Amino acid sequence: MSLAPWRGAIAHALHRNRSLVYARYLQLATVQPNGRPANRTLVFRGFLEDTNQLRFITDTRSAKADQIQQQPWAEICWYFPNTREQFRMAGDLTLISSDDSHQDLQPARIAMWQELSDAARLQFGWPYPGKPRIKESGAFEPSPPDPIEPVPNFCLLLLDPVQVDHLELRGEPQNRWLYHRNDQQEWSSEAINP
Amino acid sequence: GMSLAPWRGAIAHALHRNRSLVYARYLQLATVQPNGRPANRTLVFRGFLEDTNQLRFITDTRSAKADQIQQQPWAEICWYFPNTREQFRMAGDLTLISSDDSHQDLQPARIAMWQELSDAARLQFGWPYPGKPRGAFEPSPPDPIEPVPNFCLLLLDPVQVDHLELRGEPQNRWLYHRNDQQEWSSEAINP
Ligand SMILES: Cc1cc2nc3c(=O)[nH]c(=O)nc-3n(C[C@H](O)[C@H](O)[C@H](O)COP(=O)(O)O)c2cc1C
Ligand SMILES: Cc1cc2nc3c(=O)[nH]c(=O)nc-3n(C[C@H](O)[C@H](O)[C@H](O)COP(=O)(O)O)c2cc1C
Incomplete structure (x- = not known):
């Protein structure tokens, strides 16, 4: 509900990379049921309003759908080529499909659908x-x-x-x-060695 | 294998056709942590190892990925080439060659890689x-x-x-x- 402390950094990266269509492409890593990693590119589709959640779309028929259902924890790696910066972001995924698991987020799903291009x-x-x-x-x-x-x-x-x-x-x-982010939803930060 | 893999031409073409972008040699390597969670970070591609289909990278023994790989040496790279708008995902086993005695036959390769780096x-x-x-x-x-x-x-x-x-x-x-006889198959599949 409060803006996460890295949101400004993301905004500055997106702005300074706006000349590159592909600066909105990032890599999402998941774990397969067999324990092996999987990694693929997705398009970042903005933050969900009034949250710090990132939006993507995917097909229920894709492999990642079942991987996510079994282990929702993912890590994205996002590289911004004009500014030579990387964000790695780890956390839980929510997959909102036509099933009844996340009825409260159907409006978000419907909005996303509507915001897409025809293509x-x-x-x-x-x-x-x-x-x-x-x-x-x-x-x-x-x-x-x-x-x-x-x-x-x-x-x-x-x-x-x-x-x-x-x-x-x-x-x-x-x-x-x-x-x-701790169990109370409070963020801490620290400078660390590269 | 020692024969060129059937995707090697495609990688060569991608590298050539994206050569104006320094960052076309940056790719993302996903591993799994001991707690079962994925990890994902960018590395620089540093060529194929001579007479093999293996991809070369460098890393610090002190980095978190080093322990991850020692415990589970199966990774998946995702490599996106922005000018040709193509992606390669590549999965297989990692070999980590440090100063320890585990891969003495690959020390020459490790030394050569070191020598090929820039001073920076x-x-x-x-x-x-x-x-x-x-x-x-x-x-x-x-x-x-x-x-x-x-x-x-x-x-x-x-x-x-x-x-x-x-x-x-x-x-x-x-x-x-690649099958256990080290033969490659290929198949066109729906996007
Ligand atoms: C630049 C680019 C953008 C992509 N955007 C998406 C996307 O937003 N959602 C998606 O599901 N797949 C996207 N893909 C395709 C995926 O990388 C992957 O091929 C597909 O989702 C199947 O992955 P999976 O088998 O692991 O489920 C994109 C691929 C490229 C190279
Ligand atoms: C463009 C770019 C290139 C990078 N090249 C490498 C590299 O080749 N090897 C490496 O170990 N880390 C490289 N890094 C740093 C890694 O992304 C990561 O921060 C570091 O390896 C620590 O990862 P780990 O904590 O998962 O071990 C690169 C980062 C960027 C953004």
């Missing part, structure tokens, strides 16, 4: 991810879905950071700060 | 202990010939590779997998 919504109508490639281009050109009402395989994914490591390569010689 | 890259290995509370950052330059004990060469040997091209019809995705 972004259209991808949720593509064939089943990871299966043998459908060779006909038609399967990838479905009619747009309802732009008001999310499709059942659309998920809003939230990350609630409880630990953030910010590394600035343009320092004296480099600066590194660790932020941690 | 070597100097970091003389910095204070990573992660502890902050002239310490301007130590005498390390010997450029002989690696310091906290220098590690880190190798990743991929067993599975997922290559996604966002500039396709509409996107292309290929999965490559």
Whole structure:
């Protein structure tokens, strides 16, 4: 509810990297049921209003959906190329799908769906991810879905950071700060050796 | 394997076609911690190890990832190339080569990596202990010939590779997998 102390740093990184579309791309690591890590790029879609949670979208049919359901803890690594800074953020994921697990967050899911472009919504109508490639281009050109009402395989994914490591390569010689949230939701920070 | 893996051409093309971006050689390495939680951080890609398909990186023995990898030497990299809009995910086992006696056959490779670094890259290995509370950052330059004990060469040997091209019809995705005979298969898959 109060802004986390690293929010200004993130805002300054986003602003100074705004010329690069890809500065909003970050890597989300999860753990598989078999204990091995998984890592893939997602698009950052802003913070959820009145919170410090980061928003992403994903398909319920993707592998990460089941990984997250079994172990919701993730760590993102986010590198900003124009300013040579990295944020690592670890915390719990919430996956809001069409199931009834998070009814209180359906409005957030619906809002996200509606805020997307047509192109972004259209991808949720593509064939089943990871299966043998459908060779006909038609399967990838479905009619747009309802732009008001999310499709059942659309998920809003939230990350609630409880630990953030910010590394600035343009320092004296480099600066590194660790932020941690305790059980009372209070943040602490400390400068640490790179 | 000693034969080039079938994804090596694709990596070569990506590296070439993104050569104007220094940061196209930065990638993110995910590991698992002893408590079961993931960890993810950027590293610099420093080429393939000669006569292999293994990727080279460097790291400090004092870093948290070093203990993580010693306990669970399976990692997944995610590598995004911004000008060609393509992603490689690569999973497999890591080898950490330090000054200890565990990989004597790879000491020559560790020494060569050290020698190939810039002076600036070597100097970091003389910095204070990573992660502890902050002239310490301007130590005498390390010997450029002989690696310091906290220098590690880190190798990743991929067993599975997922290559996604966002500039396709509409996107292309290929999965490559290595079997226990060290043979690679590939398959076009839905994005
Ligand atoms: C730049 C870029 C942006 C991406 N954005 C997303 C995204 O926001 N959500 C998503 O689920 N996948 C996104 N992907 C695709 C994922 O990286 C991955 O291929 C897909 O989600 C399947 O991952 P999974 O098998 O681990 O579930 C993006 C890929 C690239 C390279
Ligand atoms: C662009 C960039 C390149 C980096 N290159 C390396 C590197 O090659 N090796 C390394 O150990 N850390 C590298 N780092 C620092 C790591 O991201 C991380 O802060 C450090 O290794 C500590 O990680 P750990 O605490 O998980 O061990 C790099 C960071 C950035 C942003």
